[PDB]
Paper text:
Kinesin-1 (also known as conventional kinesin) is an essential ATP-driven molecular motor of the kinesin superfamily capable of processive movement as stepping dimers toward the (+)-end of polarized microtubules (MTs). To limit wasteful ATP hydrolysis and futile runs, cargo-less Kif5 adopts a compacted autoinhibited conformation that involves an interaction between the motor domain and the unstructured C-terminal tail centered on its IAK (isoleucine-alanine-lysine) SLiM31 (hereafter just IAK motif).
To explore this using cryo-EM, we designed a stalkless ‘bonsai’ kinesin-1 chimera, dubbed Kif5bMoNeIAK (Motor-Neck-IAK motif), which fuses the N-terminus of human Kif5b (motor domain up to the end of CC1) to its C-terminal IAK motif via a flexible linker. For Kif5bMoNeIAK, we recognized two distinct populations of MT-bound motors. Irrespective of the nucleotide state, they were present either in a two-headed state with motors zipped by the autoinhibitory tail or in a one-headed state with some tail density still visible associated with the MT-bound motor. Tail binding is not restricted to the two-headed states that offer pseudo-symmetric stabilization, as density is clearly present also in the one-headed states. Upon superimposing the one-headed and two-headed AMPPNP-bound Kif5bMoNeIAK models on the MT-associated head, again a high level of structural similarity was observed (RMSD = 0.2 Å). This indicates that even the additional presence of the 2nd-head zipped via the IAK motif has a negligible or no structural effect on the MT-bound head. Despite the presence of the tail or the zipped 2nd head therefore, the MT-bound head has an extended helix α4 and ordered loop 11 in the MT-binding subdomain, associated with a ‘strong’ MT-bound state. The helical turn of switch-II containing loop 11 contacts a fully ordered switch-I-containing Loop 9, closing AMPPNP and coordinated Mg2+ between these elements and the P-loop. In the presence of AMPPNP, the MT-associated head of both single and two-headed Kif5bMoNeIAK states exhibited an extended helix α6 and docked neck linker coincident with closing of the nucleotide pocket around the ATP analog.
Author numbering:
A (entry chain t): 921 to 926
B (entry chain A): 1 to 37, 47 to 437
C (entry chain K): 5 to 334
D (entry chain B): 1 to 44, 47 to 360, 369 to 436
Amino acid sequence: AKPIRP
Amino acid sequence: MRECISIHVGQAGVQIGNACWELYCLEHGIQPDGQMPDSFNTFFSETGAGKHVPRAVFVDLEPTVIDEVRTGTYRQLFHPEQLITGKEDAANNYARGHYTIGKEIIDLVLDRIRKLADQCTGLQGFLVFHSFGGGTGSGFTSLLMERLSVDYGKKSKLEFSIYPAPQVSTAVVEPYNSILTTHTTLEHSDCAFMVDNEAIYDICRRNLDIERPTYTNLNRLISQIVSSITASLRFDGALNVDLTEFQTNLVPYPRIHFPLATYAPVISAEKAYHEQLSVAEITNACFEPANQMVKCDPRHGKYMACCLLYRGDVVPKDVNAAIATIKTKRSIQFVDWCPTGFKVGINYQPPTVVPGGDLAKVQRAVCMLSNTTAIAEAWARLDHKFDLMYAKRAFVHWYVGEGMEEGEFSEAREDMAALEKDYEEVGV
Amino acid sequence: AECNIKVMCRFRPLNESEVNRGDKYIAKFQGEDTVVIASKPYAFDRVFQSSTSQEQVYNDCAKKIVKDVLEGYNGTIFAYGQTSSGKTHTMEGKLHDPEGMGIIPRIVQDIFNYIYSMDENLEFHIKVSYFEIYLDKIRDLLDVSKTNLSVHEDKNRVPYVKGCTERFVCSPDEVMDTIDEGKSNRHVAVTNMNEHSSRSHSIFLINVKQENTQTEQKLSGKLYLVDLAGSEKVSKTGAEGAVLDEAKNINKSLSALGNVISALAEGSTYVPYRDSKMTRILQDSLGGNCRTTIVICCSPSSYNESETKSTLLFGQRAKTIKNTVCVNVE
Amino acid sequence: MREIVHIQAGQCGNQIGAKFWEVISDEHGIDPTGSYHGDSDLQLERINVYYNEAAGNKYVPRAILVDLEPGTMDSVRSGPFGQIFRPDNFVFGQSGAGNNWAKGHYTEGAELVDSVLDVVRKESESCDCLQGFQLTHSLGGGTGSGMGTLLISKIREEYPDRIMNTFSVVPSPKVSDTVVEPYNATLSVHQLVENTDETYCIDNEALYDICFRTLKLTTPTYGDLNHLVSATMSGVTTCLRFPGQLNADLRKLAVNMVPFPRLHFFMPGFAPLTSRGSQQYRALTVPELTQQMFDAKNMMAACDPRHGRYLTVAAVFRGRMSMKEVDEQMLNVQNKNSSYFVEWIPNNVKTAVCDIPPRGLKMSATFIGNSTAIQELFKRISEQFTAMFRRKAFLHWYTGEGMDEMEFTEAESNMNDLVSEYQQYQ
Ligand SMILES: CC(=O)O[C@H]1C(=O)[C@@]2(C)[C@H]([C@H](OC(=O)c3ccccc3)[C@]3(O)C[C@H](OC(=O)[C@H](O)[C@@H](NC(=O)c4ccccc4)c4ccccc4)C(C)=C1C3(C)C)[C@]1(OC(C)=O)CO[C@@H]1C[C@@H]2O
Ligand SMILES: Nc1nc2c(ncn2[C@@H]2O[C@H](COP(=O)(O)OP(=O)(O)OP(=O)(O)O)[C@@H](O)[C@H]2O)c(=O)[nH]1
Ligand SMILES: Nc1ncnc2c1ncn2[C@@H]1O[C@H](COP(=O)(O)OP(=O)(O)NP(=O)(O)O)[C@@H](O)[C@H]1O
Ligand SMILES: Nc1nc2c(ncn2[C@@H]2O[C@H](COP(=O)(O)OP(=O)(O)O)[C@@H](O)[C@H]2O)c(=O)[nH]1
Ligand SMILES: [Mg+2]
Ligand SMILES: [Mg+2]
């Protein structure tokens, strides 16, 4: 699990 | 000497060839074992003492029927290297015959033909026997014709096909195979004589009074026709005709090389009597639409060129009278641009009757090979069946799954449509 | 709402193998969206001429699909054509060239840029799948152990491949590395028409799952990028042996795809999706919840006129297919 | 050349295969000990198709018999024609499936499928030109449906370019022998559709009807039904063994009779079929054979062909007969029944004639029909499956062995798609 965010 | 190479492909081809070679061996007085107890070099080759090796190449992907030849009465006639068998059949698949399974015995048949060619001095042409619709007789014959065109080319190439009938048919993928093979082999064959089993069935029913015709009788009739076609080379007579003569008299334009044959008199032993069987009568009966060997009425079209090959006791005065009577008739339509569409050939050898055969001993006979525009309607109905099957795209995956593009069907349809339009144009 | 398939046509420059053998440019272009071959109109959304660059085709074809995938819809882009037509060049091309990169690198770079440009309250998970179809077998191009896989169905009856390696990504560098590893395991054979002919139907899958912290709204997105193999003819390809078997399977699968496209175009009932693995995977792409664009690449030489006409007819029939696309709200 | 590997899975498959091998051996003149005492050379000419050789002119059939219980294998061995089989070929476990598809396809069948495949592979390697595989099973059982499906899938993935013709026994409509017939049938069809080239659907109800009406048998037994199935099994592949005027292999029949990949479920038939005391009065000729073949009562599947349209028909004749007679009979049959035949396929019938009749008969034939009426059987199977699946009845036995509900839904969706496809072409 590797989320990305702005 | 003038010699021809005979090639038989597929079950129909090999059955026809067995009948043809029995007829030839009886004609030249050759026992099935190959020992005779000239005029035989055209179809037979001579060994040091006795044995005669026919110039034949029997090829089939099914080993069954070639094995029947190998074990039959004509076991010691052919050189066993000539009879070629594979492992599996073409399964009524043009793709299997041409691309996948055909390209495993094509080298062997090419080598056998080349070896036979090196042993003939005055080669005249090839007599290819095959059947449209079958997997082998539509795929393997196309590959063989392509190879023969590439290799020899200048040599003549004659075909004796079994055209699919209008109504009577056996396979379900027959229109696909027929259109594919007629698209591929239009540019290679020089004169393809077509027959259909339905017409020969009808001829047997009406003439020989046999209500149950089978493949043996049809093959015997085809053998008689081909013997009449090639008898000019073997024996002497007035106005002998060669294969180049056939091609240059029966093919007006390069893309029109699909004549239809007719034979007469086809009578039984009972009707051998009570009939004069005169030359004029035989010619008239040969021009009748019911006696044609393709299911098409010539009255719905115009004759382009017609060559007659008379046999037996025939005098040119009778031939001229018969031709004049035919010309004066109004029902027959000969095209404007062919003022003389008649070629004649007389040979002194009467037709022979195989023992245990339906045909009767007759003094004289003819083989009328005509190029009429009435063959367009057969192409029309074949194209209609193809279009009906291809609109729903039925059975296409079987052909596509063995190396054939979906666009090849459209290309073949376009070529057949072009052939139809060309026939219509030459008609007017 | 209903949206149509956006078929776009691309014509490549003549290659060396055709320019040196008596060939002539048969394609004649008029306007900006029509192509005339042998005096027969063929109207598409946009027809690209010979000199069209990669930036142009990407901006006119795939930029909308990135925003659609991020917003929550589904997308699908696949290339159909003859051997040596431009499918691999259009889709991927040279992987690292700034000017020669195809649809896939531009899509991934723009998807990451739009993610960076979004609002701060959103969170995203991106997963990448990459497989191919070979001899009616689905092989994972990221793990060679998966020799063959199976296409199953979901609860709401949408097909999907089970067991494909789902590698999470964070930056476009990992996506590019995954693409490279998948490409190196793809099957390539040398035919007469093309030196690097692809013998498998590659598929690129990216799921962009979207979650909002404030409003708890969760949106999904499934983007399919497919690079089909071309229709081949034994006369031109000269295949013998394994290459012939590959050609047989490729022709069978492409015929199945043509059958399903014709079925959708004719408004039939059965719409045979189940005749092949490729037709199964792209079922929702063609007749379901996807906005798909077909990029048909066609050879403009006189030596491939029949194949070019077949490809253009396939594209024309595909333009009339209607799709029902709705936002995936979980 | 063109050999056929024969597989018997389950009690039904084994008791049909035993009669099949007795029938074939009688046709080829092979006595039970494996010796030969025939009368014609055409028997030994193609004895390689269904037999191998051994020292001392002993012929061992290439039969591979598999089951999860040894009782039926023991019954086959102790029978009158049981010692002909190779003793190494019998592959059997000891825990039966108990009419559980999951047990026969996931847990118990997996422990035997490896040795089964080893025997199959050895037999195939010993073959010269492998033409195809032959399997007999019953879809409504545990060992049959599951193990046969698993073995079919494995052999298909091992030999992708060879025919796989399976003679399966579909559940009877009116009478259900086992309470788990719908589940097993649907789960077996879900893989038969994808992993077979031509499957022949037989249901015992039609066999009982044929025996009671045509054969006029007071007490039909399983032996008679297996005998009637063995007759059509032999007649399908008669061209592979004997010469004939027109020859058709299994792949030829598949090309002719399978228009689209998923429509390969066929209804078998046979003729002539008369009762003792009636042969002296009948007329043995081609028109009679064609009328009997195309009748609805003679079909060996519980699907009336009148409620549908034929797609493709194969007629594998046998004996001495005129080709023109056969073609005329087929043409007039197509003409008189234009409503029951499809119009976008001209010449729906196929004909093959083999010039060797079965013993004691002057003429014989076999009927293979691809009718859209076969959707009725699948429709009723799907209806029963939905009825038993809405309420989760009899489901824990299958779920306890490792299956999932999603697999059942996938199988139902596949069956419904096949039904829709068949409905479309009507
Ligand atoms: C005096 C005479 O001619 O007797 C016939 C006979 O009367 C009839 C009624 C037979 C007879 O068949 C039956 O009664 C029968 C019983 C159970 C299941 C099916 C049929 C016959 O028993 C069956 C037997 O069949 C054969 O011999 C075939 O080779 C057949 N053999 C077997 O099925 C077989 C039976 C026992 C052991 C080994 C083989 C066969 C058919 C197809 C493929 C291979 C073999 C024949 C002609 C007869 C009898 C003896 C009365 C019929 O059957 C067959 C298969 O030919 C029934 O309708 C036909 C028409 C026959 O004329
Ligand atoms: N005249 C004649 N026609 C035949 C004969 N056998 C088959 N045919 C016709 O040929 C067609 C079937 O093709 P075949 O020649 O048997 O098939 P094949 O060429 O052997 O190809 P495969 O068997 O599929 O490998 C049908 O139209 C038959 O009517 C025959 O002995 N004589
Ligand atoms: N737009 C283009 N401009 C320049 N060269 C191109 C273009 N499109 C294709 N080519 C060249 O054609 C060759 C590639 O064929 P490619 O475009 O890879 O065929 P393909 O569609 O992948 N063939 P196939 O896999 O059999 O369907 C390459 O070496 C490209 O350089
Ligand atoms: N004709 C015939 N049918 C059978 C025989 N044994 C079982 N059946 C049928 O096969 C079905 C049961 O499947 P079965 O093969 O016994 O289960 P399995 O052993 O797990 O494969 C039922 O419809 C039975 O009527 C037999 O010996 N002959
Ligand atoms: Mg054959
Ligand atoms: Mg490629």
